[PDB]
Amino acid sequence: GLRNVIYINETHTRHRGWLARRLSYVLFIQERDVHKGMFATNVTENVLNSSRVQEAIAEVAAELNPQSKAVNKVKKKAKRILQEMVATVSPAMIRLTGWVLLKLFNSFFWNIQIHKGQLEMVKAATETNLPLLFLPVHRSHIDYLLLTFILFCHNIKAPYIASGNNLNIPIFSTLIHKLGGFFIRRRLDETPDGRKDVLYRALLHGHIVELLRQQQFLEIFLEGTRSRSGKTSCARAGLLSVVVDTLSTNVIPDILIIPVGISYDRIIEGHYNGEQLGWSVARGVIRMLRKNYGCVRVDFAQPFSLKEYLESQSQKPVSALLSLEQALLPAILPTDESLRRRLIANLAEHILFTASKSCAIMSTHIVACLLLYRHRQGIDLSTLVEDFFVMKEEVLARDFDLGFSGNSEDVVMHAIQLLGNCVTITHTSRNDEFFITPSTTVPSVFELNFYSNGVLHVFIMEAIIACSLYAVLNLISQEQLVRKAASLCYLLSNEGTISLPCQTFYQVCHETVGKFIQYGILTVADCYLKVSQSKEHQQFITFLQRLLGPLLEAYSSAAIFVHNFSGPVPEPEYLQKLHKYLITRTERNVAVYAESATYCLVKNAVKMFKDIGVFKETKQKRVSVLELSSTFLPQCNRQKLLEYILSFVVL
Ligand SMILES: CCCCCCCCCCCCCCC(=O)CSCCNC(=O)CCNC(=O)[C@H](O)C(C)(C)COP(=O)(O)OP(=O)(O)OC[C@H]1O[C@@H](n2cnc3c(N)ncnc32)[C@H](O)[C@@H]1OP(=O)(O)O
Ligand SMILES: CCCCCCCCCCCCCCCC(=O)OC[C@@H](O)COP(=O)(O)O
């Protein structure tokens, strides 16, 4: 029971006729309920006459004086900030854009998909007069257009978008303002001199408080940059802090939060290989628009009350303070302000996990995952389809929705075409059937791994258990296995999201080991578990072990490089030196997985070593220097770290 948003017929309009059926797209746009009264009125002057914004202007004035006529200058400066921040929505512009996007999307997307039952729950959240917060996952540039367009198509008033200062340029900026995008400064720092702009913070905080006070829907991307690995990066708690600061003071009654999972079959930007490693524009843009991409599916997670969440947290016991170093180091080597700063960081992480889980599994996503890990060398089309059907059902067994819904045979033939740069379709002698082999070259591999990462969040937990089984072997004690897997969670903590922030890594592995008993892979003999020895079960175990190949091999390779590290180094210079070493391994052909050379896994590897405390980080001016820690100063300790990460990866 889904709905296509792009599909428009004489049935969708009120008037049916020879003329009307031709102008169907125009008739649909003239039947929307966007009548201008609902949007924010007189924002600028309502922000200027807020007590704190006046206190900020009043204090910045009291700094510049060596009687006090300089309030007008800083007030005029403060007005000029708001002039280029606040969005002025024009429903005239909305309808024109909506008509253009309906034509453009219908060209280069095969369809867009909405679950009706979900969007009735968003409609119910609109029917209550109370402000909403739409928090989507950032995948592509098309994310900005999709969320607004889907509400506009169900005549829910268009949201105000927290727009990056990057997009603010002459002429083009005022078009964004008409469509509800309000530009926000990056880093709340105009210049180092004076530190934070007390004036600018007051205006930003004031604007958001004023915009929520008039009961209107807000859209914030928690991931500052769109993901280049193909999986959700770490959260940013910058704007949520203001929203919670609003609700904390009891200036507004309550806010409803909606995590939004957007999924593409093939993103418009295509591959990311260029940034994943290290006239002319006009040719590239025209070549992009003519290419027809696959399906799209936007899912809305059930909305919750921020007040009810924030209360529920205040009832919970003492938050665990276990440090990543304090957790792991024992295994490898045998505050009033901070409490709230943790509370917002947890909320942000909690939303992104809910948002990431809501994203549907596309045909491409599965095909990539099967090609890279289940076969790799190459397999026949008839054989690939039989494996595709077995993969398809495993995703539905864990309660994830699929984007593809057609015939199993066809969907794969459609999916292979979209990965045409990565894949080659040959002919086997004496076999009237297509043979497929994925590209193992460093430029091509990355593109497959990007679309393959789409399915990783389904199997990430079982994969952590599947690796632990191999680690504990080289009968299994229940307590011993879970403790081993719990340590691997802290190691792979930095990359992606593994569990909900409320649940500890122990109990998640403990219930995942519980699920392994249900499936019948492990059987009960503290308790002793036996691994089942069947042709069907083993190929599932080996699949899950290979699925954490790149993630572990990158860390293994990074840990080897750490051996020959001398003297303090700048991090931006160090990342380049480390990245080159992983790229070298793929050229020499000593590396098992070419996927591991990706830049995202280099950032994670270095950011992970900081948390364990291999690198001591003192920072000055802009760039932070990396000093070798007192614990990992000697040669023997660096080898002990390498050995531990090696124990997980297959040999
Ligand atoms: C049918 C019609 C269709 C119509 C079509 C419509 C289409 C229109 C197009 C619209 C275009 C839209 C573009 C959207 C994009 O491209 C997305 S660009 C990301 C934007 N949003 C964000 O940036 C999200 C994250 N925001 C932030 O992080 C911030 O907003 C900044 C940004 C300041 C960075 O932050 P900064 O570098 O300053 O560092 P910070 O670490 O965040 O610290 C800043 C301050 O934030 C507070 N804070 C931070 N962490 C916490 C925390 N955990 N708990 C509590 N408070 C916290 C605290 O005040 C600490 O200050 P200090 O540095 O002094 O500690
Ligand atoms: C503002 C709304 C007005 C309505 C019109 C909007 C229509 C959609 C605009 C097209 C989407 C944006 C195009 C971005 C182009 C771009 O960024 O180039 C692609 C490269 O990075 C990819 O490089 P690589 O990662 O090396 O493959």
Site residues for ligand 2, CB cut-off 6 Å: 100, 104, 141, 268-272, 274-275
Which of helix, strand or coil describes residue 584?
A: helix
Identical topology for domains 363-439 and 550-646: yes
Q: Are 162 and 184 in contact (CB under 8 A)?
A: yes
588 assigned to a ligand binding site: no
At which residue do the structure tokens 């027809």 appear?
A: 292
Q: For CA atoms 32, 35, 39, 43, give the dihedral sign.
A: positive
Write the DSSP symbol of residue 361: B
Strand partners, 133: 218, 257
CA-based nearest residue to 109, from 368, 287, 291, 298: 291
**Alpha-carbon distance 26 to 80, whole Å?**
39
CA of 641 to the centre of ligand 2 (A): 43
CA-based nearest residue to 230, from 554, 579, 595: 595
CA of 23 to the centre of ligand 2 (A): 29
**Alpha-carbon distance 642 to 445, whole Å?**
26
**Alpha-carbon distance 635 to 633, whole Å?**
7
**Alpha-carbon distance 512 to 461, whole Å?**
7
**Alpha-carbon distance 273 to 441, whole Å?**
12
Looking from the CA of residue 98, the nearest atom of ligand 1 is: 1
**Alpha-carbon distance 631 to 613, whole Å?**
8
Write the DSSP symbol of residue 372: I
Right CATH for 32-312 from 1.10.101, 4.10.240, 3.40.1130, 1.20.120? 3.40.1130
Q: Which two tokens stand for residue 334?
A: 């045998």
Segments making up each domain of the chain, as ranges: 32-312, 363-439, 456-541, 550-646
CB of residue 236 inside a 6 A radius of ligand 1: yes
> Where would I find the H helices in 128-178?
143-152, 172-178
Strand partners, 115: 2
CA-based nearest residue to 509, from 486, 526, 480, 491: 486
Strand partners, 528: 477
Q: Which residue's CA is the nearest one to ligand 2's atom 5?
A: 101
* Geometric angle at alpha carbon 262, from 260 and 267, rounded to 5°: 155
**Pairing relation of β-strands 476-477 and 160-164?**
unpaired
- Provide the b/e sequence for 38-63 (b: ≥16 CB within 10 Å): bbbeebeebbbebeebbebbeebbee
CA-based nearest residue to 491, from 272, 649, 302: 649
Q: Which two tokens stand for residue 520?
A: 């019948």
Residue type, 190: E
**Alpha-carbon distance 325 to 311, whole Å?**
31
CA-based nearest residue to 204, from 236, 257, 246: 246
Question: Phi/psi of residue 74, each to 5°?
Answer: -65, -35
Write the DSSP symbol of residue 155: T
At which residue do the structure tokens 């609700």 appear?
A: 247
**Alpha-carbon distance 265 to 287, whole Å?**
19
Which of helix, strand or coil describes residue 43?
A: helix
**Pairing relation of β-strands 434-438 and 423-427?**
antiparallel
Helix (H) / strand (E) element for 81: namely helix 71-83
Nearest bound ligand to the CA of residue 237 = 1
Q: Extract the runs of DSSP E, i.e. beta strands, from 303-422.
A: 304-305, 379-380
Q: How many residues does the chain have?
A: 651
Residue type, 599: Y
Going by C-beta distance under 8 Å and a sequence separation of 6 or more, which residues neighbour residue 581?
557, 561
CA of 615 to the centre of ligand 1 (A): 28
**Alpha-carbon distance 21 to 10, whole Å?**
5
**Alpha-carbon distance 132 to 217, whole Å?**
5
Rg of the chain on CA atoms, in Å: 27
Going by C-beta distance under 8 Å and a sequence separation of 6 or more, which residues neighbour residue 107?
289, 292
**Alpha-carbon distance 402 to 454, whole Å?**
12
**Alpha-carbon distance 474 to 528, whole Å?**
17
**What's the longest Cα–Cα distance across the chain?**
97
Distances (CA, A) of 270 to 384, 419, 441, 593: 24, 10, 17, 22
Helix (H) / strand (E) element for 611: namely helix 599-612
DSSP string, 489-514: HHHSSSSS--S-SSS-HHHHHHHHHH
CA of 227 to the centre of ligand 2 (A): 15
CA-based nearest residue to 351, from 263, 256, 452, 264: 256
201 assigned to a ligand binding site: yes
Going by C-beta distance under 8 Å and a sequence separation of 6 or more, which residues neighbour residue 313?
343, 346
290 assigned to a ligand binding site: no
CA of 443 to the centre of ligand 2 (A): 21
Distances (CA, A) of 614 to 449, 556, 570, 607, 633: 29, 15, 15, 10, 8
Question: Where on the phi/psi map is residue 215: left (φ > 0), alpha (ψ -120 to 50), or beta?
Answer: left
Nearest bound ligand to the CA of residue 161 = 1
Method of determination used here = cryo-EM
Q: Are 267 and 137 in contact (CB under 8 A)?
A: no
Q: Which two tokens stand for residue 345?
A: 């960081």
Which of helix, strand or coil describes residue 299?
A: strand
Distances (CA, A) of 360 to 138, 300, 339, 357: 15, 11, 35, 8
Q: For CA atoms 452, 453, 454, 460, give the dihedral sign.
A: positive
**Pairing relation of β-strands 132-136 and 256-264?**
parallel
Q: For CA atoms 473, 476, 480, 483, give the dihedral sign.
A: positive
Strand partners, 569: 626
At which residue do the structure tokens 């990396």 appear?
A: 626
CB of residue 345 inside a 6 A radius of ligand 1: yes
Give 242-295 as a 3 state SS string.
Answer: HHHHHHHCCCCCCCEEEEEEEEECCCCCCCCHHHHHCCHHHHHHHHHHHCCCCE
> Where would I find the H helices in 109-235?
116-127, 143-152, 172-178, 198-213
Q: Are 50 and 206 in contact (CB under 8 A)?
A: yes
CB of residue 164 inside a 6 A radius of ligand 1: yes
CA of 583 to the centre of ligand 1 (A): 33
Q: Which two tokens stand for residue 446?
A: 């990355």
Which of helix, strand or coil describes residue 159?
A: coil
Which of helix, strand or coil describes residue 170?
A: coil
**Pairing relation of β-strands 160-164 and 295-300?**
unpaired
**Alpha-carbon distance 20 to 598, whole Å?**
52
Helix (H) / strand (E) element for 569: namely strand 569-570
At which residue do the structure tokens 């505050």 appear?
A: 335
Fold of 550-646: Arc Repressor Mutant, subunit A (1.10.10)
**Alpha-carbon distance 87 to 184, whole Å?**
11
Q: Which residue's CA is the nearest one to ligand 2's atom 12?
A: 141
139 assigned to a ligand binding site: no
CB of residue 471 inside a 6 A radius of ligand 1: no
Write the DSSP symbol of residue 420: T
Write the DSSP symbol of residue 626: E
Q: Are 98 and 184 in contact (CB under 8 A)?
A: no
**Alpha-carbon distance 162 to 105, whole Å?**
23
Orientation angle between helical segments 91-108 and 143-152, nearest 10 degrees: 110
CA-based nearest residue to 466, from 649, 230, 229: 649
CA-based nearest residue to 216, from 152, 146, 160, 155: 160
Q: Are 117 and 333 in contact (CB under 8 A)?
A: no
342 assigned to a ligand binding site: no
CA dihedral 338, 344, 348, 350 (to 10 degrees): 90
374 assigned to a ligand binding site: no
**Alpha-carbon distance 629 to 635, whole Å?**
12
**Alpha-carbon distance 149 to 411, whole Å?**
27
Q: Indicate the class that CATH gives domain 363-439.
A: mainly alpha
Which of helix, strand or coil describes residue 240?
A: helix
Q: Are 182 and 175 in contact (CB under 8 A)?
A: no
Q: Which residue's CA is the nearest one to ligand 1's atom 62?
A: 196
**Alpha-carbon distance 14 to 496, whole Å?**
47
At which residue do the structure tokens 């490693």 appear?
A: 277
Model resolution, angstroms: 3.4
Q: Which two tokens stand for residue 61?
A: 């004035």
CA of 574 to the centre of ligand 1 (A): 27
Residue type, 175: L
